[PDB]
């Protein structure tokens, strides 16, 4: 009795068995009881929510069963700490991974509703800037699919990356109010709310140190379910929200906004460090709450065993304060000896590096750290002293090495090198692509690689075949399925078997048919939503990624102006029609990035209206590039632009998405491009330009852009056009900053790769002229894209860093 | 087909038929799917939410059916505009009105849960300061119960009235974060979001005037269901929330908080005007959005008919901008002639006055109005000019009358008298108690009553018998029910029939038994929650209401010190044991109110620890008085203190609650006390002190507190104790401001009513000494409390102001 009567309360029976009748029944229940509406007043958005709640209900039993499972079994837990999780939309993904897509599609059909229309109502959960943010998302999906006891931990931003609008040809930022109509996926957990401390001071009492007189900010966690692919595993992504703890009364209540501002906006910087105190607060905020929750879970089914039960993966140095914080907790609060604590910390943390550009790495001024986090600075100084002691003993006499390896950067404004803090406090440091990891070992982290070689590894990036194939390209996924089955969805290497079809006329016809369907669908979408007309029988040339000088959208710009100038030169000469699409967001304070967007639209303004050009060349800027737009444009792409200066793009992931969806690649030997070319065969790739060794040689003697300008007539013509106002009649000097940079301050040597890039593009169009051969080369690409699935990347992280074994065994 | 297939989507079948099996089934469903939890980790709060969602589901069909009904039938609609709705808790109330209380009680029993415990988790929706806010709430309940097509319209405050804490004997304010764990009762309605304009300027174009260059703030509505008593009617309370429309990017996103601050906190002023611009914004905010929604609904099933279809009731002058706003819309936007528009407006609006104190009435400086609402000020000036033209024609030559009646108050700081704007723009003005309405006609609104007698009415206040009897005193409700049935719950006049039992020994025994049960339960609650010990066999003397000088808690203080001094004087003389309880909140900036709370605790500090006093007298301050505490302490009260200075308390409603729950009343002939004494018979009341005419006579010759001090030795002793530090040893002069006010600046003549109050209290204890006679007098009170049910008040408003007929006919 009594407590035995509570056994009734169980998940036991849900919405049935996963079919049309019960689904309709539940959609209906949600529309009336959850949305408090009826068919006469229900809005399209209401229907979207009704469907989303019905689908979400199917996650619950699994979600509860999975967490119960980890509690019972008690496996080692993996914690992915990141300040970004670029999740995109959740509805379709959930349906696909739960195998409910068809049933929901039919149930919504019988209720007279269009599921595709409804899916379009959901907006992106854009809590990320780009690559690094999307990687965390793909990683969450793969860890679930591989049955790992993994937890994603981040910040629940009220405003994700800004929604970009184009006005007058310029980018305009708009707050991304994604939580306006609520979020049907998350579930707040008040009872796990935790306190995070700031400022204050340190007093050294008999016992040890004490952090006193601090300002408190509460951290309320919101859980979002992350379903693996058809294995009945539902993992959790826990995002923290800032809440005030509990000039006059009114102002005091209005001032609660100050403390809650911590989780207000995602800083829109991609590959760029901005030392704003509010960002430092966000970083400490996610770290402090996360570590408390991790230790709680550890204590609930001493610390010697911590590393055998916990793995903390730092996505970049953003959550690096986890190192000194874990030490603070173990030493100050748990009272362990420093060295035993340090052993535990190193064994627990591992650091992932995503870039080699100096301006993209974190170096916090010590004055900012001493006032905001006084005891963390003290602990960092002690970590530094003991680390420097070790290198000094390993390399006696080498004082300059000590200076280079120090966690503290002396100078006008003393700063703390966070990357150095991470290497010292992690048992594994990793690059995200073979070439990148090697560059780390030879340049920026060389001193560290020499002191601790065992620490450095590589983990080439990947993307999830679920969202990036099954989800976004059903057509491609089905034709691949009719030939080889469905086991590839969680074993991408099986795509290899498609090589056996390279000379199969049916498959060759099908690959091309799927592509043109996608091209047609994308063209329809652009005309409907933006009233933009694009020629579907043109080659879709696409460069989508954040706007950057290192990504060289400018090089792409030089090429399209070349294509235009050549056409005007010889109007009646045939050219492979092209629709050149460039999309991506610029960071608010990045002037050159904003000028590049303006140059792109400016070029289009001339190119797109020249009668002699007509249907032959069209240049368009894809506004507001985000995960959901990627899922639309990537599958309709013919040519994938991956032209960063060799040695600058650590890996890239968009490159992999384009390859998986049937596009041929034109790029440099940079990042993962190297490994992708290796996988498909350089003969099936369009690699061009300088190699890393080539830019290094140019650096040794000095890069003189004038040389290339004096030697290339076609290049001179374009700069002359830019400078004279040909692309900006009403404001002739509009692009003088672009021209000046290119001519005298180009760190990314655009002119040095111009000629080879233009020639390589000539060969791309030569191949496109032969559909049969273009398609056969495409098949050889898709068939070798298997190594780039995040399931592979994750399995390596698991076996070589976390010390846990992946698994595709389903739960009941 | 197609659109005929959507007929399936219907409310048709819900959670069954209203019994235990289906209720358990649904509680369970909600716990797993809505809270995403299971019995092993569910917290008590989770269970509370599970139960609340299950109950809420029963509201939906009715809620949808009711609104559909008003749309089909299209009755005249009544709009109750108020800046406060003191709703208290919703769970029990909903269960009671839907007749689900017993079933939920049993279903939660079988699931091993304690419903009472769970109900205690819900916190008050304290969006009100006191009387005026509670009245709107009681009114919402009665309008539903009387089948009126009524809509409550207000602001969804993020923070209601502050939670009061007592520290060191002083009040400490704490933000009331009532939406922290979410609100299971409300349902946001994004699609009805509306724009509200501020600042800007006015330009007079050919056509007419135009309000241009304004700052926009969006208004998002949240609906809360309000169920009538067992008639299947569910009306709506629509509360507006402020949302920003869509120094750098980051700061710009952080600055969205500024516009959303409008709906952040309820100003904690009770009977006091504070001219803060943020308050003016809140007032315009609720008015502008509300009027747009009202006109939308009007247009969707010309303006001549507006008054036949719309009634706008202004709760005080808070939403008075509705008058100039309705004119702005009709003239500027709908292009109607001024006079036809004015006719429509007056016929549509009616104003309710709640006080006569000058400091409690709204007078907005014109500079504040010209910058924030430039065209409203222009319209107010035109309304003034035309109104003054009418009085001038009605009273030729009377220039001083024009000056007194003007909507504009000249002087150092020109201001707009909002009460005057309301009378001019309403077809009915009303006081809230017979004596109050008459005072309006003879003093403050005299000039207006002389120009338009037909306009002035009275509508004596009431309280709802559902929440204030059935809900809070089940014991009393059941014994009354065993004698006369249940029809009284929506026909309170039937309580009259209990007079037939005044000499019935069973009923007499039962009334006293119910009271002592409540006294016992309250004593248990105070010891559990506050570790406060009170003697259950003492007479519970209670004064709960906001702390004010006009309410004279100080007079009550003088009495308890008298009781103490008399006991110390003659220790061995018998006295009726008393537990004097005083509770209520002080406005943050009201110094005297805060000193009074401190004096109360100070007195307790001495009284409660004197060994010779022992169990005989105990003085306690009930911390954080709010609607849910009222429901607990009022039913356990023996003596209800209603001692405001005659002519100051417009009505009062707590007085009525105490009468309905079996407490005898000690008070002045003020507000509704007059009508309550009339109903039960003054012989069954404890009326004392000066009457209105008596304070007026004192005012004519001058109030000299020194006279009373020189003539009353016992009074002199107390002031001497206060002044010397007897109640504040460590800070002797702590209460010098209280003493100084009483001696020389008492606008409320406390000393003038001291002697009569003390004697009247002697007679109260004389009666208490005789339980049988105390109880019989109590019966005569409860039996005549019927006129004070808000159902009566509302029926009068309906028939004499709104022009609509009440109805108890149930819906299916
Ligand atoms: C006690 C063991 N856990 C478990 C079986 C959980 C569960 O049943 O979760 C389901 C409702 C999705 C879960 C959990 C526990 C308490 C409140 C809320 C959650 Cl969410 C967690 C966690 O920290 O999140 C567990 C853990 O490990 O501490
Ligand atoms: C079209 C007629 N109305 C009606 C039958 C309603 C209804 O079915 O509401 C149910 C979901 C609780 C209701 C309504 C209409 C559209 C969206 C949301 C609501 Cl809530 C209202 C309103 O303004 O609130 C109506 C009105 O009058 O305009
Ligand atoms: C995959 C992805 C990225 C990363 O693209 P790269 O070309 O590797 O820089 C950026 N943004 C979005 C929306 C993505 O989907
Ligand atoms: C009824 C009520 C009031 C009004 O009380 P009066 O004594 O009429 O001023 C104030 N506060 C609360 C919580 C109430 O329930
Ligand atoms: O590692 C994930 C991604 O992180 C960053 O955004 C890098 O610029 C990119 O090259 C890398 O692919
Ligand atoms: O009208 C409702 C209430 O409004 C105010 O709070 C008055 O002080 C009170 O007397 C009245 O009862």
mmCIF file of C-alpha atoms in Angstrom, chain A residues 82 163 251 268 434 571 656 663:
data_model
loop_
_atom_site.group_PDB
_atom_site.id
_atom_site.type_symbol
_atom_site.label_atom_id
_atom_site.label_comp_id
_atom_site.label_asym_id
_atom_site.label_seq_id
_atom_site.Cartn_x
_atom_site.Cartn_y
_atom_site.Cartn_z
ATOM 1 C CA UNK A 82 30.905 24.177 -25.567
ATOM 2 C CA UNK A 163 19.232 37.101 -38.529
ATOM 3 C CA UNK A 251 14.830 49.980 -9.858
ATOM 4 C CA UNK A 268 28.604 36.691 -33.160
ATOM 5 C CA UNK A 434 45.415 15.749 -40.372
ATOM 6 C CA UNK A 571 29.936 38.023 -76.456
ATOM 7 C CA UNK A 656 32.197 17.398 -46.404
ATOM 8 C CA UNK A 663 28.793 18.260 -55.691
#
